[PDB]
Amino acid sequence: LTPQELEAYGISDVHDIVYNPSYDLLYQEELDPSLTGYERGVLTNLGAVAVDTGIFTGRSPKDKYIVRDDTTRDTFWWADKGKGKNDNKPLSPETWQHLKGLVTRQLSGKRLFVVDAFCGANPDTRLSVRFITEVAWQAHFVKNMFIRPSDEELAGFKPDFIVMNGAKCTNPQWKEQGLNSENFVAFNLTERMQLIGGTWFGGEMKKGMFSMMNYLLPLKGIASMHCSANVGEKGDVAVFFGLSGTGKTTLSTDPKRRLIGDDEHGWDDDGVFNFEGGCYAKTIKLSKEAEPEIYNAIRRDALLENVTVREDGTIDFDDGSKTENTRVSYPIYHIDNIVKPVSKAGHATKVIFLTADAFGVLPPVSRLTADQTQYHFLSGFTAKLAGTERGITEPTPTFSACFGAAFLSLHPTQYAEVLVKRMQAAGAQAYLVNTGWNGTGKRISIKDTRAIIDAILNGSLDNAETFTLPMFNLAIPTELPGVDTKILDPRNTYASPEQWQEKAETLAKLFIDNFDKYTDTPAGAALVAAGPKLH
Amino acid sequence: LTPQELEAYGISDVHDIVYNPSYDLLYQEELDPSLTGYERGVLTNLGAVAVDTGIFTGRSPKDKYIVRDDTTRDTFWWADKGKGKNDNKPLSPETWQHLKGLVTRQLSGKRLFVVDAFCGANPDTRLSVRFITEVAWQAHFVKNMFIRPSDEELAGFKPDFIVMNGAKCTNPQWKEQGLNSENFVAFNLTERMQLIGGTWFGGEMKKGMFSMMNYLLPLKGIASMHCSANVGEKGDVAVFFGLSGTGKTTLSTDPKRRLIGDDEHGWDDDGVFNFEGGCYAKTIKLSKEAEPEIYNAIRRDALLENVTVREDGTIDFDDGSKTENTRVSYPIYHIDNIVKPVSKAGHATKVIFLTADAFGVLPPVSRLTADQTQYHFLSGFTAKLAGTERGITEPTPTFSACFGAAFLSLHPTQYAEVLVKRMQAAGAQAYLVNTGWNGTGKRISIKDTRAIIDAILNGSLDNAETFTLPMFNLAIPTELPGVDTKILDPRNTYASPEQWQEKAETLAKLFIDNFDKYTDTPAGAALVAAGPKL
Numbered sequence A: 001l002t003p004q005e006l007e008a009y010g011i012s013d014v015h016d017i018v019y020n021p022s023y024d025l026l027y028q029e030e031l032d033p034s035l036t037g038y039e040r041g042v043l044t045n046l047g048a049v050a051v052d053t054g055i056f057t058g059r060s061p062k063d064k065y066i067v068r069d070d071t072t073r074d075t076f077w078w079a080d081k082g083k084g085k086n087d088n089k090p091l092s093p094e095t096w097q098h099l100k101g102l103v104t105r106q107l108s109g110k111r112l113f114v115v116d117a118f119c120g121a122n123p124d125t126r127l128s129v130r131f132i133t134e135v136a137w138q139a140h141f142v143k144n145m146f147i148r149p150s151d152e153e154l155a156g157f158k159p160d161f162i163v164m165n166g167a168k169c170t171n172p173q174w175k176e177q178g179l180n181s182e183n184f185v186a187f188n189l190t191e192r193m194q195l196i197g198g199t200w201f202g203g204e205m206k207k208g209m210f211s212m213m214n215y216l217l218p219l220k221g222i223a224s225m226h227c228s229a230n231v232g233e234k235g236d237v238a239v240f241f242g243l244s245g246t247g248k249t250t251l252s253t254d255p256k257r258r259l260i261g262d263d264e265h266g267w268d269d270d271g272v273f274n275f276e277g278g279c280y281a282k283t284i285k286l287s288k289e290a291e292p293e294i295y296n297a298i299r300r301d302a303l304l305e306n307v308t309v310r311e312d313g314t315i316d317f318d319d320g321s322k323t324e325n326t327r328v329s330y331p332i333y334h335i336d337n338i339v340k341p342v343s344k345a346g347h348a349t350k351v352i353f354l355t356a357d358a359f360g361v362l363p364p365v366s367r368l369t370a371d372q373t374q375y376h377f378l379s380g381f382t383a384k385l386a387g388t389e390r391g392i393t394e395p396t397p398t399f400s401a402c403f404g405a406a407f408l409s410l411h412p413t414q415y416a417e418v419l420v421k422r423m424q425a426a427g428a429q430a431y432l433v434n435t436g437w438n439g440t441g442k443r444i445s446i447k448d449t450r451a452i453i454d455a456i457l458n459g460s461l462d463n464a465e466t467f468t469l470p471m472f473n474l475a476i477p478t479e480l481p482g483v484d485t486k487i488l489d490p491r492n493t494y495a496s497p498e499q500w501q502e503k504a505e506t507l508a509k510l511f512i513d514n515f516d517k518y519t520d521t522p523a524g525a526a527l528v529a530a531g532p533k534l535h
Numbered sequence B: 001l002t003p004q005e006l007e008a009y010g011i012s013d014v015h016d017i018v019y020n021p022s023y024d025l026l027y028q029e030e031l032d033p034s035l036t037g038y039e040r041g042v043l044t045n046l047g048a049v050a051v052d053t054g055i056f057t058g059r060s061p062k063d064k065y066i067v068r069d070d071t072t073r074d075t076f077w078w079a080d081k082g083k084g085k086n087d088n089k090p091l092s093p094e095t096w097q098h099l100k101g102l103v104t105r106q107l108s109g110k111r112l113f114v115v116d117a118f119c120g121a122n123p124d125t126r127l128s129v130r131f132i133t134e135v136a137w138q139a140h141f142v143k144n145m146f147i148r149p150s151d152e153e154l155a156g157f158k159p160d161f162i163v164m165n166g167a168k169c170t171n172p173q174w175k176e177q178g179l180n181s182e183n184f185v186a187f188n189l190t191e192r193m194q195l196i197g198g199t200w201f202g203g204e205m206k207k208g209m210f211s212m213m214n215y216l217l218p219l220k221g222i223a224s225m226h227c228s229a230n231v232g233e234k235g236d237v238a239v240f241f242g243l244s245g246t247g248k249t250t251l252s253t254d255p256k257r258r259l260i261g262d263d264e265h266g267w268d269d270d271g272v273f274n275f276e277g278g279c280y281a282k283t284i285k286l287s288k289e290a291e292p293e294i295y296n297a298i299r300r301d302a303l304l305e306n307v308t309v310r311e312d313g314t315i316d317f318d319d320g321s322k323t324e325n326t327r328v329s330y331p332i333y334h335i336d337n338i339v340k341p342v343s344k345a346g347h348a349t350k351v352i353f354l355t356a357d358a359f360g361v362l363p364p365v366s367r368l369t370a371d372q373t374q375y376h377f378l379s380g381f382t383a384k385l386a387g388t389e390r391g392i393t394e395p396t397p398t399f400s401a402c403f404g405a406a407f408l409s410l411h412p413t414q415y416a417e418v419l420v421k422r423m424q425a426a427g428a429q430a431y432l433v434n435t436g437w438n439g440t441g442k443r444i445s446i447k448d449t450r451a452i453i454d455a456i457l458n459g460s461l462d463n464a465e466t467f468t469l470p471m472f473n474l475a476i477p478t479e480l481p482g483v484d485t486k487i488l489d490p491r492n493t494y495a496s497p498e499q500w501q502e503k504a505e506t507l508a509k510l511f512i513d514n515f516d517k518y519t520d521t522p523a524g525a526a527l528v529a530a531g532p533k534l
């Protein structure tokens, strides 16, 4: 790649270009002792480099902006146009040029790392993305998280999107421009470019492209899903929707299943496919005994983010002092139990919605009807966990449409429409699984949740006998192998069962009020009957 | 024991009776592979059987009821009497007959375990209790926790109280009967009976008899105390009042002192006596290095409850993901440094109130005046630990009258009256010891607290020079061997003494509001002067 080729993007005076850096090169660069500040890396006992990101320990949804122009005006789900809140705040073309100037100036006159990669496992729908950074570890992050092209694919590489990471710069004019802060994560779908200013959080470099796939794929009838995905020995695929920290990484690395992916998937005529080339796993409280596949992926070429490293070089995975949202990224082949040669398989037969219910009202597991599936997908009731977005310090209940509202570029109903079409063609059954808390105020045990997933995936619940929870009208299995029957009814863990009724009424009303905005069509109005009902 | 004898309690068609089974038989019965559900027992690598009680990981005070009849109407400290918060909820005789029928039908038509035992080490005041269960490990629990009679004592054993464990049954009529849930822990002082319904937590089988002793003993001038107790070489006894998990087990373990007991004691004309035959110890975070004596009691004939047992049979004592209130019970002789063969000694001369102060206000040690002894006994400021009662999941500050409000059948002042009488006759001195937290937000170190107990027990503080903490007016020793003098004043862990005053006045207000219910008598009104003064 030529300096002039990067001059097309507005960068000037490019010194040297480190194109498609190898893992060996990134390792040496990351340990260079001349690095300062948030560029510095340290080597841990496990052989993986660890970095820190300052206060930027989670995403910055309040600094997310999309240029409103002829490409996006009539197609985007805008933060200032709908009944439903979202983070897609409109940006003017003039202000975009100002932000782009800040970033290109910052990346000018410097040695730059350039990573070309794919978002999307399938050539017919993938984005070719060119990432530009001045920091080796940020280049390493995107080499891990996106799909690494072959040499032949590189020779003919034509980028569809450019991502420029200018974490080291900020926008001093932000107040007068009506922006939220001196930081920015900005998208222009006409120039096909993402800018990062101020924030060093690794996730910003992957969830931008997820948002772009969430724009392009549902318009072509392909579902675009915030879920993990795995497959059984017989080719049966399951997808697990949820926010990070609510169980989708942990439940998807099941030893009885083979991993398709961690976080971002599409569903087309052939099946369920991963967008990513790696996994960005939460490491708080990680242990070798509890998560052996993930723990073993932490070795050279993994990249640890905000973990506490002792003076002797060992990692204290239990220490959330910099943040609870500690992370590691690794290329997906650091897990042996994965689908190869491409991260994809056939249609999903099981759809699992993970809800971290902080009210302790919902059952550990419920088998949803078809209408309840749409109702609960649009609702997206769960919790934001500490650190996942800046400013979140404790589990925060939320209605996150499609279990991923922060990444939606289209209206929630457009994701629901495609998901339902694909589920119906497959005969897929959906389940609502509470990975949050119960009446004891304690978190539901991962041992119980894994046993529940086992029972879902082997088909044993599809026709099992059930009872119905009042108010929510959720069908609960009467018994489940490997789990204390008494915990299946969320009422039993209450010292006084009337307290369940009270909290359930409260949560039922939150659901009804949240769902009202989806009832402006006959189809949406008809789903109210599948939601919770007050007496 | 014959079937006819149990049919007198209302049980029908009794098949086999397993009467006072040995420890060896109970081990065989608990490992029967045909057992399902909460009945199942597994063997750990330490040789102790472990059981799991599901969602019943602590006491159920909201399910505790006492029949209100001619025996109890005028004497019990009822929950609806308007004289302070308590769990003594009244039950009608009619609803009692319904609950009893649920349990007796549940126990009918099957093999029963019967354990006869004593509550109280002295024959003159002890209850003879007969426990009936359909689960071997529940019989094991009571074999551990109550006093195991000799063959001669079983010969003419005559029950004073019957405890029926019907954990496997529930009450479907609970809503219309005005009860809290389908579970129940119910007491009838006229029939002299306890019923257990629905809940499998072992401690329900011991704290019910504690509540009965707390009724019967103070009415005849015998103190009934939620405390641990031990005795030195000279015969001097100490009692440590407090809630479980706030130091009474740990601090009574002391090479200079033989253990009398862990949790429940009486104090009569002859001295201090354990009610129990064993210990029900909290095991969260237990380690051999930190609690060697308790750890070494976990072996065959102990009974682990809700501890995590791995697939290889090892125990993960640190895992609180199900509950922090993991427990083990063992007969007391699993501790070597004990008073034997009877768990009793003379009069106490040192009385230690343990307060787990979550606000970092109170001194690690204060020497109380006579009026302060009553004021702080009645206030019972401390904290309830996670899991000890259902629904508690973090340290919870509480005013637990007499350091055991959950078990008081009479008004708090009746326990204070008898305690003061015994202390005064014995020349006893009281100390208030903070086992909780200091200004920094960290917990007071056990090493400091152990040095404090040493200094109390050898009499070195009784005449030592003191200074006075303001507001609470607490006499603090000016120095103390084995602790850095810095720690004795609770202000020193605050940036400024004004920052302490801030916290202190907040807590003092809670003390004053909590004590006001005691001020309708001249004596109670006079005690306000011994409390904190804003």
Ligand SMILES: O=C([O-])CC(=O)C(=O)O
Pocket: A059, A203, A204, A206, A207, A242, A243, A244, A263, A280, A388
């Ligand atoms: O998945 C979410 O909800 C957030 C996240 O991981 C990311 O930041 O990359």
